C-alpha cells in the first residue's frame, strides 16, 4: 500500500498571459490601466499577496482552488497589459474585479487578507473613476 503519501498538493497551471488567436488592442485606457491603475496598485503596502497566482502549496491553503475556480491576480494582469493580452479596459477591469472578489469568497470580513483587498479596491475605484478619452 503507498497510503497516497505521494499525493502531494499542487498548484493549478496560472492563468495564461498570452494567446496569439485572441484579439487584442492597444488603447489609450489600457495604457492608462498599465502605466497608473495597477502601477501605483502594484507600489501598494498591501499589494504584495496580489503580486502573482495564489500559490496554495506556499501557503498551506490545500482547499483554495477548491473553492476558487477562476483565480486572478496583478501579476498575471500585469504580464497581460505588457503583452498586449487585451481587446478593451473592460476585459481588463473584469480581471481585477475577479481578484478582488475571489479573496472575499476565499476569506472573511475581518481577516487581514480581507482588509487588504478592501483598501486596494478603493484605490483601484478612485483610480479608475476617469479614463483617458
Ligand atoms: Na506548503
Ligand atoms: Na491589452
Ligand atoms: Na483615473
Not at 487584442?24 to 491603475?37: A, F
Not at 486572478?72 to 500585469?78: C, E
Request: aromatic share 12%; proline share 9%; net charge positive.
Amino acid at each position: 500500500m503507498h497510503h497516497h503519501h505521494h499525493h502531494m498538493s499542487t498548484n493549478p497551471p496560472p492563468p495564461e498571459t498570452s494567446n496569439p488567436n485572441k484579439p487584442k488592442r492597444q488603447t489609450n485606457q489600457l495604457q492608462y490601466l498599465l502605466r497608473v491603475v495597477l502601477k501605483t496598485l502594484w507600489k501598494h503596502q498591501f499589494a504584495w499577496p496580489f503580486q502573482q497566482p495564489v500559490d496554495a502549496v506556499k501557503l498551506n491553503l490545500p482547499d483554495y482552488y477548491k473553492i476558487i475556480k477562476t483565480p486572478m491576480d496583478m501579476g498575471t494582469i500585469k504580464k497581460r497589459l505588457e503583452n498586449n493580452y487585451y481587446w478593451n479596459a473592460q476585459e481588463c477591469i473584469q480581471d481585477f474585479n475577479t481578484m478582488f472578489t475571489n479573496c472575499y469568497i476565499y476569506n472573511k470580513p475581518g481577516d487581514d487578507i480581507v482588509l487588504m483587498a478592501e483598501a486596494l479596491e478603493k484605490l483601484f475605484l478612485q483610480k479608475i473613476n476617469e479614463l483617458p478619452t
